[PDB]
Assembly symmetry: D2
Homo-oligomer: 248 residues x 4
């Protein structure tokens, strides 16, 4: 596989996009640390990866806690000896409210996971990668890293911040054998959108020129490309996988 013997960390890997990324990494021969805040999801993800013949291990972490993220990177090295690839994917949507109505608690929570947790991951991933010859980071952003999501101002602000952080890391580490890029999915059909009525999902779909929502596997293909040596001249960039959402 194209990631043979690389060690890869994925946060939020118990479901959705992160689960598809963990599967993709493992299918291409990486040794994958599956991290999630939910141990049942994380353990099941690992068992499913191994059932297809891949190599994976579970490590629990809440990415909003910098101590836990630091320990997660240390545990990755303890288990597999190094860190070559990291995908900072864990995130939450937050409450839906007008900005003037937005709860202080929901603002803090969304920014703590979707931004601070990505920074903590990058921080400790970068420190380990400088010890084993470099590596590659993919940050999960969103279309809402470049356009608004009305009623989700904390999410939009955090995802914009992830785009900026990614530009900074790419520029700073360009000559340190480390690359960092961000992925911007549009709306992806996962059990998270379960509560939407058919009419609500049809309204969402109408905002995608391709006439459907995306699949987690289609995001994971882009993450895999950006994590592999095929993307060797790509750093600091933001890469849409949006069905045309932001083209209009």
């Amino acid at each position: 596989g194209i990631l043979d013997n690389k060690v890869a960390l994925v946060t939020g890997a118990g479901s959705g996009i992160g689960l598809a990324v963990a599967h993709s990494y493992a299918k291409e021969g990486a040794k994958v640390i599956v991290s999630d805040i939910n141990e049942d999801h994380g353990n099941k993800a690992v068992e499913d990866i191994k059932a297809q013949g891949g190599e994976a291990s579970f490590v629990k972490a809440d990415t909003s806690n910098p101590e836990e993220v630091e320990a997660l990177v240390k545990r990755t090295v303890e288990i597999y000896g190094r860190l070559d690839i990291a995908c900072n994917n864990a995130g939450i949507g937050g409450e839906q409210a007008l900005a003037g109505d937005y709860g202080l608690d929901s603002w803090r929570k969304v920014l703590s996971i979707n931004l601070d947790g990505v920074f903590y991951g990058c921080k400790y991933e970068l420190e380990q990668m400088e010890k084993n010859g470099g590596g590659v980071i993919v940050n999960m952003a969103s279309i809402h890293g470049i356009v608004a999501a009305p009623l989700s101002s904390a999410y939009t602000s955090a995802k914009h911040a992830v785009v900026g952080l990614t530009k900074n890391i790419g520029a700073e580490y360009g000559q340190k054998n480390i690359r960092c890029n961000a992925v911007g999915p549009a709306y992806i059909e996962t059990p998270l959108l379960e509560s939407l009525t058919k009419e609500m999902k049809e309204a969402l779909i109408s905002k995608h020129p391709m006439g459907r929502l995306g699949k987690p596997e289609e995001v994971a293909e882009l993450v895999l490309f950006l994590s592999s040596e095929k993307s060797s001249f790509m750093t600091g960039g933001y890469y849409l996988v949006d069905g045309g959402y932001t083209a209009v």
Copy 2:
């Protein structure tokens, strides 16, 4: 004046861009609440505004404290009866370090002032504006809301987030008689930059096609335009005042 008898709040108005904005607002007839964490600076700004024929009052606030931001808007209404215009300007540059070396507390300090304080301002400003017929908000971002500042990842992340928040508020409040836009200055001549060597200053100027740094009054002219009725069809937007910095 083009803001005659509008009530306008400026945070961080004791120095630099914020001071120039407060003077510009007052020159155009606004009743200005000068807010700053430094009472000496804020009271001096009010005195200088009054000596040039304008109207202003000082209210102390730390924008990283949401109770103090809510109280700042309340005090504005106690003094001048309403809130028509707000410029969320207060910010800090932060420590300079590679992302992997960036301090945990340093990261949170930059985000708390440069992003959370802007959100707190917008939240309590919007609350009041809905009570008195609408209003206009200008958020101070940076060129580093759209391009990296190597060694300043927290600042870049915060300023990117301000751009996203601005898009969200503009979209959400478009039919609520409220507008919100962001300004993106490049490097501006202030005493903050007088510590740089001859070498460092010339290198910074070399990144601006106009061949010089900007002046605070030049930023304030754009803030003034975006705070006035002349910008009546402009909302959710990001507006450079950058000497060409991001054109290349």
Copy 3:
């Protein structure tokens, strides 16, 4: 007036945004060359401007013809002595058709006016501004300088190109006392479907675009160059 004793040129000034720009320039004291391909609309614009107390003169030009644009700048200097400000505004919508269906000549016609005419204006305006101490250019782009307009691919391509041209002029002339910026209006007066794409819940008015052009043409915008400036009612925020 904030443009007192400046000489300003506006293309496509017989109607719509260009007419509002010419009025705004003249109200602020500029001597305005109203240019349009339609003599009747341009002469009427000049008469309305003078009726308001301003100074204006008409010069006909087809901006798709580079010789006529060069002559337009020459006539500006013959009439008012110099050129301080130029707004490259003349444009056309073009046929509505899928990109694969778009006519070859229809494509070129939209690009010739909406891009080549803006370049010809910039070229000869820059030439003159370098003789009289610099100046300021505003290029009329569109929201479709940064997002697609389905069935109008030629227009979208042309307006994207105007944004890039503007970045290049701003960068090139930064130390030559010349600034150049681009304005990006959304839709300016079913209209219901169109209005639903604007968060402000209405279309824009030409005077609202003109206020931004005036700001970018004045000394108030003195540290602004190479930039793209939306006046879009929130259209591109989502």
Copy 4:
């Protein structure tokens, strides 16, 4: 091969990025039409592709001539029966002059190849793709589709236009089983750059945070990804391969 049973067209394929794209397509099983104005370059490219085990045929075309582009697609169908993938890559650099000094013929020439030729390609490619059930187009843009290249205003204008055309095609054809995306390379090491001195190339490399120029194969990897089913939810987008150039 991930392009088994596909037919792919590449313009400007006798050298540089286009040659690398043609090789990458052929390596993955596509039947490749190599097009170029230079018959010696194009026939040699085909010779090299076949020596690597691939399938390819040469067709001469000047992309600024719409009749030749129409004939190029017609000949592709005559040789291989269908058209699945097209990379519109042929381009020129243009006169180096200030915008006010730029030649009228120089402007026309750059736009005729770098924009009109891309449009002609898309037009006749889309026409055939509609006849055989869909397809994928990749348009070669540049970093100068989003940032200036001083002294190359025509190039920057044209490449910006290609980004806009790509957004339009992606949005218009989203439900017609056609995707269209643009690639934005920074400066790539090819014989084209041998006219620069030791000093000029060092200055050019200093504008890339990765500390080197790109290789044509690194661009071709992104083109291949965007041409394959791996990018199935990606359309209308612009994708940098820039070594960090536009991150700052």
